[PDB]
């Protein structure tokens, strides 16, 4: 049950965020592997550099490309995806 907490992307890309995340959950149990799955997917589809954080108790301070940022809860994992470079 994805719950977008703060997103900058277009609805279509957002849809892909939740979709790719669902796939990652479907296959990887470890948070790292989930993040790598997501990161690689968007980095391959689009081009540039994306980074993904997945956890449960966390804050951060990053810079990100306009319309290339999301902070959400999928199930109960906090996914923070964004594009820098």
């Amino acid at each position: 049950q994805p719950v977008i907490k703060n997103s900058d992307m277009s609805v279509e890309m957002q849809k892909e965020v939740e979709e790719v995340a669902k796939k990652a959950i479907d296959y990887c149990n470890t948070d790292k592997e989930i993040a790598t799955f997501i990161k690689d997917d968007f980095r391959s589809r689009y081009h540039g550099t994306w980074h993904c954080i997945v956890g449960r108790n966390f804050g951060s301070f990053v810079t990100f490309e306009r319309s290339y940022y999301i902070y959400l809860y999928v199930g109960q994992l906090a996914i923070l995806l964004f594009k820098t470079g």
Binding site: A35, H51, C52, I53, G55, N57, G59, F61, V62, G85
Partner: protein, 89 residues
């Protein structure tokens, strides 16, 4: 109580890193403190001190995968359970 866990950069800037995190704690040391404010402070300080494109990330449960510049990465832990990741890209 600083405990370096993953170091990649130079000693000097390491020392400054600890001092800056410390200062962030003092700046925000109350239950009402949010790790976010200190994160702002670390990123902006290392930007205005050692140049831009720094990222300050603080918390205790989180897995991360990022692209960082060599000799500009540090990760560490505190007796207070504060796991802080800092990196330049």
């Amino acid at each position: 109580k600083a405990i370096i866990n993953s170091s990649d950069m130079q000693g000097d800037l390491l020392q400054e890193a600890q001092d800056v995190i410390q200062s962030g704690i003092e700046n925000n040391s109350a239950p009402v403190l949010n790790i976010e404010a200190a994160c702002k402070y670390i990123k902006e300080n290392l930007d205005k001190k050692f140049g831009p494109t720094w990222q300050c990330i603080i918390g205790e449960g989180y897995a991360y995968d990022v692209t960082v510049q060599n000799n500009t990465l540090l990760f560490m832990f505190y007796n207070g359970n504060l796991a802080v990741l800092i990196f330049k890209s």
